């Protein structure tokens, strides 16, 4: 060992006798504060291990050969012009046979009708080799269920209609403006981002059926359509690509470099911090963090309010920290309930300064069992609550508007088909709101308090959130991954190139 190493051992052990021996009375008062500082540095290194970020890597692409017949599913509104015309020619140029099946909003969001229309379009002819879907290019909402985008309901109905038929063809899901590769590229659409959240889960649940996702630029083009068929038919193991005028890009998760420099933009709380799902699991941990940081008023919101499981227990703890608590029983999905909540409960002396959206319905299931009615319940509060709160709080300069996303959106996990799309939509809303000059942060959270993914201790998780808020951290991914077992299990379900830039994951498979 060295003399510097021996010094820190005496500091951590809190051995005053050995400390003065390691160097050449006043040490009694110094030692506890110094050992406490050394403890916070060990927790900071553990916090640095939790940080990751989704990035877009440029990749080189040269006349790929297409085989068999390519069933191109498309909405009835866009058929006859735009992307559907140029994609049909690009597959014909490469060798394939296009079968452009035009489908309306009603048959598209129903698996029985969609499967019957696919069966009729294919007819007695040979089974298709690929199925290129342009259904996500519909920006409208589902009839009667406004929180369910047409893009999501159609994509879910398509994968399950194909499973009902058992065609064995590879399903490539095409989209436009669902992802942003270079930041200033443009903000994403929440309706189309939900499709990626769905798609990553579909990729792990049905690996053979699902081929991947490809994002397209705004204007249709012959050269872009040629590059689209080039990556679908080509020998590229990339399941998440995005095409632009610049070239081809691929989605990659990577560790965010450690801060190692003072974050001189301290999280200054005050006024009123609105927290949805405050009585719930993650909501209660956020309330503890805010009251300890020195908040003035914490307006906790939930469907239960004071008549919750541990509301009286939580209020009696929170009061001792130094902040006024006012919990409420109001549903974040109803717009009229949120309008009256931002006036009756929030006082004038402490205006709304920050919003922390953590509300979600406890529904989860396999792709086969999902339905549009089941998706409305989840997206009513998760996405619907976020847009209602944002639109009404425009007449107020907010400090922060954090949205609680999840690891299910960032990389995906089986069984999160009615969970990951809503989280992916929040990520898209955050970058759309930052483009409007407003503060927003979509945190891809891990489990709090599934194999490989270790549970985050709430104290370390709220510290990572605080440091991300202090920095202008756009879309941070905070999760404790055991890359060794996680990267192997993820590859066993579906072999992917997404965890290529993480050295730990790249090594695990070799």
């Amino acid at each position: 060992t060295s003399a510097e190493a021996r010094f820190w051992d005496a500091v951590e052990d809190e051995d005053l006798e050995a400390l003065v021996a390691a160097i050449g009375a006043s040490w009694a008062g110094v030692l506890p504060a110094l050992a406490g500082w050394r403890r916070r540095q060990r927790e900071q290194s553990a916090l640095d291990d939790l940080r990751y970020k989704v990035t877009w890597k440029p990749t080189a692409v040269d006349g790929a050969s297409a085989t068999g017949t390519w069933l191109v599913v498309v909405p009835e509104s866009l058929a006859g012009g735009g992307w559907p015309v140029v994609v049909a020619r690009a597959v014909d140029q490469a060798g394939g046979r296009p079968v452009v099946l035009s489908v309306d909003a009603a048959d598209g969001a129903d698996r029985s009708r969609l499967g019957l229309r696919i069966h009729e379009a294919l007819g007695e002819g040979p089974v298709p080799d690929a199925v290129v879907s342009l259904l996500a290019l519909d920006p409208s909402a589902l009839p009667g269920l406004p929180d369910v985008p047409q893009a999501l309901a159609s994509t879910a109905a398509l994968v399950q209609a194909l499973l009902d038929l058992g065609l064995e063809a590879r399903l490539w899901c095409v989209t436009s403006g669902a992802v942003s590769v270079s930041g200033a590229d443009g903000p994403s659409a929440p309706e189309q981002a939900a499709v990626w959240g769905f798609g990553r889960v579909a990729g792990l649940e049905h690996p053979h059926l699902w081929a991947g996702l490809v994002d397209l630029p705004p204007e249709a083009d012959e050269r872009t359509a040629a590059r689209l068929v080039g990556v679908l038919a080509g020998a590229g193991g990339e399941d998440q690509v995005a095409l632009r005028s610049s070239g081809v890009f691929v989605r990659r998760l990577v560790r965010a470099p450690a801060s190692e420099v003072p974050a001189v933009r301290s999280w200054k709380p005050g006024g009123t911090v609105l927290v949805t799902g405050g009585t719930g699991g993650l909501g209660r941990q956020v309330a503890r963090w805010l009251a300890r940081g020195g908040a003035d008023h914490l307006l906790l919101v939930s469907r239960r309010g004071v008549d919750a499981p541990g509301a009286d227990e939580l209020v009696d703890e929170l009061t001792d920290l130094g902040a006024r608590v006012t919990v409420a029983a109001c549903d974040v999905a109803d717009r009229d309930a949120v309008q009256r909540l931002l006036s009756e409960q929030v006082p004038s002396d402490a205006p709304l300064t920050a919003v922390i959206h953590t509300a979600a319905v406890l529904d989860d299931g396999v792709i086969d069992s999902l339905s549009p009615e089941r998706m409305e319940q989840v997206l009513r509060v998760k996405v619907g609550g976020a847009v209602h709160l944002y639109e009404l709080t425009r007449e107020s300069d907010l400090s922060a508007f954090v949205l609680f996303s999840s690891f299910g959106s960032t990389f995906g996990l089986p069984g999160l088909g009615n969970y990951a799309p809503g989280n992916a939509a929040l990520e898209a809303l955050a970058e759309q709101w930052r483009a409007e000059g407003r503060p927003a942060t979509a945190v891809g959270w891990g489990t709090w308090a599934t194999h490989g993914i270790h549970e985050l201790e709430p104290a370390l998780a709220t510290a990572a959130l605080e440091q991300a808020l202090e920095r202008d951290e756009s879309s941070p991914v905070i999760i404790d991954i055991d890359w060794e077992r996680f990267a192997v299990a993820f590859h066993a379900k579906r072999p992917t190139r997404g965890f290529e830039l993480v050295p730990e994951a790249q090594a695990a498979l070799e």
Binding site: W483, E484, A507, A508, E510
Partner: protein
Amino acid sequence: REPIAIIGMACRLPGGVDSPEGLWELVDSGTDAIAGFPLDRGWDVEGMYDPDAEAPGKTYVKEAGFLYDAGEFDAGFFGISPREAVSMDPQQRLMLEASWEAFERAGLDPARQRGTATGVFVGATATGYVSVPEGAEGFAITGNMTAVTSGRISYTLGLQGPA
């Protein structure tokens, strides 16, 4: 009380011994194989010396019997990756090559022992090799289990008797 035939042997011992005949040459020539501590194992060879036996963490011994090539191993032969080999205890690695050689010296094709009632009885202790490369902590567990010093031989050669 039937006599038991020794039909093959193998060994690696200090002083350049890698075979029974090499060991014979060592004792027939009356050679002393004690030599300086290894210099490629991260040991503080200079700092650890002290003639006082009561000095903590120190030793008054400067020379001993070593296999200065203890880390040399044909990992590929046994289908072991370079990264598993680094995290693998050299005691397991030495036993794998010695076991192969001992079967060969017995006139036995080691691969024809697959599916036979061949037992493996090994004397060994845990000596702290793992005091780890990325993507090989799982390999380090079985790679450093004392039970696997015998078990890995039976696994690698498909021996069915007890290990």
